[PDB]
Amino acid sequence: GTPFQKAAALVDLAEDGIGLPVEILDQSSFGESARYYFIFTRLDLIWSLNYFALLFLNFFEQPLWCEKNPKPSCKDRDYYYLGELPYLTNAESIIYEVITLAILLVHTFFPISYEGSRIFWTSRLNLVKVACVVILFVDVLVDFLYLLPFRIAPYVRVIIFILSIRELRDTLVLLSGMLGTYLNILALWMLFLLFASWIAFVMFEATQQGLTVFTSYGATLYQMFILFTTSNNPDVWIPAYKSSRWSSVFFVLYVLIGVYFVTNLILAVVYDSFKEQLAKQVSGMDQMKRRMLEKAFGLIDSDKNGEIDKNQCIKLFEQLTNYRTLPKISKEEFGLIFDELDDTRDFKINKDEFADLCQAIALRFQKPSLFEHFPQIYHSALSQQLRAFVRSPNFGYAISFILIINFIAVVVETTLAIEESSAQKPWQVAEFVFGWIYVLEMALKIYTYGFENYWREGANRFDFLVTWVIVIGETATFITPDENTFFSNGAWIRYLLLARMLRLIRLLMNVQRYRAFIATFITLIPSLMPYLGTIFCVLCIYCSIGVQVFGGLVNAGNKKLFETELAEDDYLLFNFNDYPNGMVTLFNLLVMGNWQVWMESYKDLTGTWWSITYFVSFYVITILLLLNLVVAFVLEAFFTELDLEEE
Amino acid sequence: GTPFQKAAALVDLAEDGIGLPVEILDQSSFGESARYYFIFTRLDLIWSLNYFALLFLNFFEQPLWCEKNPKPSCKDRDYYYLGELPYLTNAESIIYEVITLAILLVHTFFPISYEGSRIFWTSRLNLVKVACVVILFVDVLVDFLYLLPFRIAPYVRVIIFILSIRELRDTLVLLSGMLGTYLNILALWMLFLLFASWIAFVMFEATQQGLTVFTSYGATLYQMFILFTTSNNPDVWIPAYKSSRWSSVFFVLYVLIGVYFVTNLILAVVYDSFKEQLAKQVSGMDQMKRRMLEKAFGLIDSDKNGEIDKNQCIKLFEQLTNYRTLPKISKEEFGLIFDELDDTRDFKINKDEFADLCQAIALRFQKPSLFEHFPQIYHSALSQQLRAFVRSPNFGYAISFILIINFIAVVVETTLAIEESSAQKPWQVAEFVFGWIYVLEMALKIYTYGFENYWREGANRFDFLVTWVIVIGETATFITPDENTFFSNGAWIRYLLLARMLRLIRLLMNVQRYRAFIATFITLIPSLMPYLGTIFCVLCIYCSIGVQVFGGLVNAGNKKLFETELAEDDYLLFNFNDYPNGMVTLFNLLVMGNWQVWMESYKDLTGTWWSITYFVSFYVITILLLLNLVVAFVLEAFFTELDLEEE
Numbered sequence A, B: 001g002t003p004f005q006k007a008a009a010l011v012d013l014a015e016d017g018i019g020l021p022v023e024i025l026d027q028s029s030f031g032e033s034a035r036y037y038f039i040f041t042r043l044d045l046i047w048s049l050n051y052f053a054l055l056f057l058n059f060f061e062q063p064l065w066c067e068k069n070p071k072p073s074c075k076d077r078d079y080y081y082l083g084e085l086p087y088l089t090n091a092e093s094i095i096y097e098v099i100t101l102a103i104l105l106v107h108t109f110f111p112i113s114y115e116g117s118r119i120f121w122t123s124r125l126n127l128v129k130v131a132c133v134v135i136l137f138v139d140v141l142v143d144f145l146y147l148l149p150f151r152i153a154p155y156v157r158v159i160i161f162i163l164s165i166r167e168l169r170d171t172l173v174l175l176s177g178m179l180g181t182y183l184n185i186l187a188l189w190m191l192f193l194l195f196a197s198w199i200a201f202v203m204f205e206a207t208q209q210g211l212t213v214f215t216s217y218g219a220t221l222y223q224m225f226i227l228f229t230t231s232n233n234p235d236v237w238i239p240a241y242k243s244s245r246w247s248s249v250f251f252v253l254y255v256l257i258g259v260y261f262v263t264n265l266i267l268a269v270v271y272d273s274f275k276e277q278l279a280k281q282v283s284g285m286d287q288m289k290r291r292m293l294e295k296a297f298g299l300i301d302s303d304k305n306g307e308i309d310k311n312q313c314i315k316l317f318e319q320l321t322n323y324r325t326l327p328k329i330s331k332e333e334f335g336l337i338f339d340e341l342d343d344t345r346d347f348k349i350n351k352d353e354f355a356d357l358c359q360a361i362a363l364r365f366q367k368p369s370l371f372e373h374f375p376q377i378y379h380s381a382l383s384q385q386l387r388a389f390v391r392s393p394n395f396g397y398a399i400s401f402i403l404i405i406n407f408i409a410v411v412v413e414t415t416l417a418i419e420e421s422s423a424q425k426p427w428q429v430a431e432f433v434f435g436w437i438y439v440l441e442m443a444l445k446i447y448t449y450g451f452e453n454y455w456r457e458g459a460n461r462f463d464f465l466v467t468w469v470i471v472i473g474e475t476a477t478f479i480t481p482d483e484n485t486f487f488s489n490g491a492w493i494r495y496l497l498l499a500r501m502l503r504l505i506r507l508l509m510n511v512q513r514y515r516a517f518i519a520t521f522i523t524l525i526p527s528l529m530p531y532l533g534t535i536f537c538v539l540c541i542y543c544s545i546g547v548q549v550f551g552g553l554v555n556a557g558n559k560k561l562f563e564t565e566l567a568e569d570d571y572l573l574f575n576f577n578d579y580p581n582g583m584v585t586l587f588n589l590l591v592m593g594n595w596q597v598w599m600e601s602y603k604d605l606t607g608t609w610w611s612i613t614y615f616v617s618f619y620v621i622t623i624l625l626l627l628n629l630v631v632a633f634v635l636e637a638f639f640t641e642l643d644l645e646e647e
């Protein structure tokens, strides 16, 4: 067993908790596990595609209320206000499920090769994975045999997706940590609602407002909760205002105190609890990483000199360069990283000085063109003058001028968006000219900056891609002047218009203050991804629940639906019949926009007051816990960067 | 001229920028100015009452649209949806205005006595004050003569009230400072709205959504601005969703980006700018305060020894204690203040050590009963055991037990809130007993702690007041059992029930985690008062404007009003006919609850697209700038208080 291989495995496990167990490092037959692990990691993209396909299966699955026999079969996509996504027949669903299950079974049970036997079965996460996959196998086998209270496949596959990604698991652990403090603050919020509703119930006992709205304590509590959400602020206390204008003072006090005090208090408590949870998790990961790096360093130096020389550290570099989970490293980057790692400047790396490897490896991003093969062309008087022009600050001025002229052309073109394509050809030719000038611009920029220097930064690659896609689109439009179903259609023209509008957005980066804010947003989006994914999974679970319980109560032939708020407001296309319909309905409830319309209506269709436990629990878990968290991150990023400029 | 008098004036000016001018300190005839200033400050409560009466005059003034001759006179409070506040006739209005104007004229022109002549006419604040008062005098004289485009008195007296209070002036200066940054971020927000609306206009050109909602660029910009506030989130893009379910992706992107990027960015920018404004203002005030303290210290020490001996420093306090604008100081507190001021512990105060006078004076709040006059009663065997009981921790346990019994009794009372008073007398006697037990409790607490000890803290005073207030009412209810219009009325019984329920809040006072949050809420409001006052003044200005322009367009006989959103939603009692009606309508717009209903409707009644400039500006100035600032203070207070414990 080569010690450098064990050190490379330890570095992989030090970068993140995913890796080989520490209990297999010194045991015999180490390379056999290593090769199997490497082959497994070669297919991470395949595994990711499989998991995403497993999740996206739910969008196309036939709803359970179609599994029965409604009086019209649900192929009439308009009767039940469904729409726009196809349904897999039994054969398609079965073959798709079998494909996904085969890939999942290979993925789940493959670790047994490189984890030994006892280690695989002694891990809680692996036990949960195997339990989920065996439940999935039993469920699909039952489906095959039948061809049943309900199908448990959506929930189990969503759980598999959640625990297949490290970030979602971390988010769930953090939410579990927060749960206690969240329940504590929820108790105070509930006490405030209960006392305020009791006060309102007693005050408006025999008044006109107590005979239409606050009929009992339960109705008063319900309406006061809705009012706390400010979804019906003027509506709820119109009778009180009409009977006595002084009654509005109490409701103004309630709304103001509730909204500002309670809402901001809940947000602050959630942010504090999540910050403490992050502190604990990050401390745990940091200690694990430090311990793993210490073990690796102790393993490497078998001479016990205390420091690592040049050749040994280089050898470690090409031993660990084989992993795909670590950043790519070049040849001279080996020496560059070794030089950067040295802090005491002694051509050697200390035990504590080596504890900064993970940060150091992905830190260079620097350093030469292929245009210097022929020096008779690159070094010329006209070439030199053009090279002087390209870095001249007036080059950006000229580009901005061309962009403004393009802006004028696009605005005048959109002005005549009603007239037919008879007079559109001169403008199309002009935009062809503009696109080809932009192509000349990018080609000249490549011809100046070189190839690799042009490819180092990512924004330049994005500009590269957008320029090519827009120019190939405009060429496809131009070189085919005859009518065709792929070039004379208005959709292609609209796409071309949007392409020019994005190219005109490019202009907005001229203003430094706006460019800073756009850069802050763009940098923020990757860091907000795990929480958005957790919200997406929660919406998936709630959509499964809503299709299960509120399945087909909204129809075109229902009688008691047309007396509800949903039909009167014309939201009947926002329902829980489909999976996509649930995806959009939970988005509409996700913003508190007329959110009580659904809760009022489905409570009527279901016929029980228990159904609101679905929506209330949705509001309490999603809006008060997750969205508050997202808003907290957005505010924190903006506040930190804002303080960063003046600091 | 006594130097100690000049030092006292300088210390008064060092506490806050309000005081005598610095240019009269060395001039002859100081006591004449000092006595006039002292007499003036003796009437600060009268001045405050006068200013508040001037501000509250607007609530009762007859609306201008009544000064004309409508077909029915506006004494019909039901025809124009007015109500509940009386109108002053011409004589009452004239006499009230003359009284207020005379008092304010005395207040404004009095500083001429103690400030010389040139100094009074060389201050910008005095110049604007005299301009406001002369404009008010001209306006009231014109009103008297007439017995006219519009009445300028409301705005003028609102500005007089605004600049009569130092905190409102400071808030206006800070808003003027923020105006530039707020305008920049508003420009960015407007660019976002403009381009998003253009993209939506060209996307949905010939679609069903472009033929009903996005008819033109102006209508699209209007609807997208409304959608930015999520006031009509599902409503606006129903046609797009019904024609193509994929069109919802664009609107989901727009709404999410708006709500979670732009709104929070505006909030962060406003908070950062305002925090910088506080930094500048507080730095200026602190430097001015230190300069004034240095001048005072240089003035007092005429021996130039560099430190003040004890007796002279004590003598300074008898001179400076005559001002009503400085905290009260007791005779024996002089030595304690002198001891606390001394940091180097040398029985003397240094030049730099004198910088902490304003902080030190209002800092002691410590240091004894009158019950010890007879020692034969207080020092008794039973009295000693009672003293042991009262400080025992089980005393609070017994109090809580009594409170829980009171809870059970009052809940059972409220259950039988429908039955009349025959069975209500046993419960009335029960609450008679409970209130008198609480009276025994508070009197016993006085007897064990003393009188001044019972009076030092303010919460004890509040408990004192509420105990007497509730017990006098409960005893007046019982001692007069016959029917009366002041004791047998149901309103009095309801007041008694609310008083008891408010008393039961003490139970929540026990839970430490809830106690901290309630304490933070109580402590925050004193610090939030100037901003709420600024918002109140802005609402006053907008109410004056709305009554002026949207005066009587909402009637019971209007034809085009019943085709608007206002009448259909039954908000007609929320209008701008009155001043109180404007006070509540601006509150409903102040919270974004169905806020576009008014803006849609008055745009129809006025018949111009310019009227929305009233509401849009109201959104831009109040909600984006002021309410965001209030939310920032609430968040900051909660966050700092929460982080205090873990630190």
Ligand SMILES: [Ca+2]
Residues within 6 Å of the ligand: A011, A012, A013, A014, A015, A016, A017, A018, A019, A325
């Ligand atoms: Ca790893």
Ligand SMILES: [Ca+2]
Residues within 6 Å of the ligand: A301, A302, A303, A304, A305, A306, A307, A308, A309
């Ligand atoms: Ca070594």
Ligand SMILES: [Ca+2]
Residues within 6 Å of the ligand: A307, A344, A345, A346, A348, A349, A350, A353
């Ligand atoms: Ca070293």
Ligand SMILES: [Ca+2]
Residues within 6 Å of the ligand: B012, B013, B014, B015, B016, B017, B018, B019, B325
């Ligand atoms: Ca003063």
Ligand SMILES: [Ca+2]
Residues within 6 Å of the ligand: B301, B302, B303, B304, B305, B306, B307, B308, B309, B312
């Ligand atoms: Ca002295």
Ligand SMILES: [Ca+2]
Residues within 6 Å of the ligand: B307, B343, B344, B345, B346, B348, B349, B350, B353
């Ligand atoms: Ca000293």
